[PDB]
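Posted in: Protein Modeling Q&A

I'm a second-year student putting together a small comparison for a lab meeting, and my supervisor asked me to include a predicted structure for Ankyrin-repeat protein B. I've never done this before, so apologies if this is the wrong subforum. The sequence is pasted below exactly as I got it from our records. If anyone can share the structure token output, I'd also love a short note on what stands out.
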Amino acid sequence: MHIKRELWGNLMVAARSNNLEEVKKILKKGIDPTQTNSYHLNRTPLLAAIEGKAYQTANYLWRKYTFDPNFKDNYGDSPISLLKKQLANPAFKDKEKKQIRALIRGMQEEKIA
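Accepted answer (user: helix_wrangler)
Welcome! Here is the predicted structure, written out as tokens:
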């Protein structure tokens, strides 16, 4: 309860910082990273990874769990729309933008299992 909320907050930080080893350790304790709620602002660690430019962690999460890439948080951002905002932002470099584009493509176009 308190424990799950403390783990969730640490999971958001680990994902935003691309600390995939610590993400994996927390998810082994039974947290479903795809499910969220009001209290957590309807965010997930997939969003956290995207906004931290933690693209390898975002890729892992996307591949290993079933996320809805159009599910919005309480700011109104989904994984896809947040990536699209990054892709349009001039501060992002070519190497980052190629990774962003590949994640958008995978989320919009890949098969639903």
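A couple of things worth pointing out for your meeting: The two ends are 31 Å apart (CA to CA). The CA atoms of residues 8 and 81 lie 23 Å apart.
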